[PDB]
C-alpha cells in the first residue's frame, strides 16, 4: 500500500500516524528508519534510551523490558508500543508493519506533508539528533 521515505521526519509524529493506519488494517512500510529525526537535547535522549537497555530487570531471567541498539529496531519498538500488540487487532497490525533497513526498494517513497512538527528545518529547530547516531553509540548499525 504505502512506502514511506522517512528521511527528515520527526519520530513521534511519524510513529502516531503510522500506528493508526495499521490498526485500520492498511499496511504501512517504513523505509530508512535511520535517516529519521528526534528533536531535543542529545544527553537526555541517549540517557533515556540507554537506561531502558541497562536492565537487568531482575538480573536476567530473559523477561522484562529490553530495548535494542540499532535505529531500525528502536523505531520498530516505538510504533509497536503505540500499538496494542496484546489484543487481536494490534497483533495483526504488528505483522502489517515492517521496517526496512537501508532502501532496498527501487520505488519512490511518500511523506506526511505538514511542517508543524513532522518535518524538521535543521537551522530552525535548535536542538536535534539523527536517530542513527544515537543507535551507533548504543552499539547498533547505521
Amino acid at each position: 500500500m504505502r512506502i514511506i521515505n522517512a528521511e527528515g521526519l520527526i519520530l513521534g509524529r511519524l510513529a502516531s500516524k503510522v500506528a493508526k493506519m495499521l490498526l485500520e488494517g492498511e499496511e504501512v512500510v517504513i523505509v530508512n528508519a535511520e535517516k529519521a529525526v528526534i528533536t531535543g537535547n542529545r544527553d537526555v535522549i541517549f540517557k533515556k534510551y540507554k537506561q531502558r537497555t541497562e536492565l537487568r530487570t531482575l538480573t536476567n531471567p530473559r523477561r522484562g523490558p529490553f530495548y535494542p541498539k540499532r535505529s531500525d529496531e528502536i523505531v520498530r519498538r516505538t510504533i509497536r508500543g503505540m500499538l496494542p500488540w496484546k489484543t487481536d487487532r494490534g497483533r495483526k497490525a504488528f505483522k502489517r508493519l515492517k521496517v526496512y533497513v537501508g532502501i532496498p526498494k527501487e520505488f519512490q517513497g511518500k511523506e506526511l506533508e505538514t511542517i508543524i512538527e513532522a518535518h524538521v528545518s535543521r537551522l530552525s529547530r535548535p536542538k536535534y539528533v539523527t536517530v542513527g547516531e544515537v543507535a551507533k553509540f548504543l552499539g547498533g548499525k547505521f
Partner: protein
Amino acid sequence: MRIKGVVLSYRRSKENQHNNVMIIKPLDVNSREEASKLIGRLVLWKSPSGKILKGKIVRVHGTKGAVRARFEKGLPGQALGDYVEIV
C-alpha cells in the same frame, strides 16, 4: 459501486464502549461536509460465507469525515473494516 469503508472502533470513551454505534471513515470524505451524502446509506459487513449485516449510517462523526453507523444487530468489532454502498 461501493465506497470503502473502514470500521475503526466503536464510539467509545477510553474506559466505556457504547456497543450500539460504530465510528467509520469512508475514504473520499475529507470533511464533516462530504460525509452527509453517505447519510442514510446502508452499510454492510461482509464476512466469508453468507451471513449479512445491514446497518445504516445516520450521523456525522467528524471533524474529518468520519461517520457513525448503527446496525440492526451491532458488529463484533472482529471486523474493524466494513463496506458502505451507494444506494
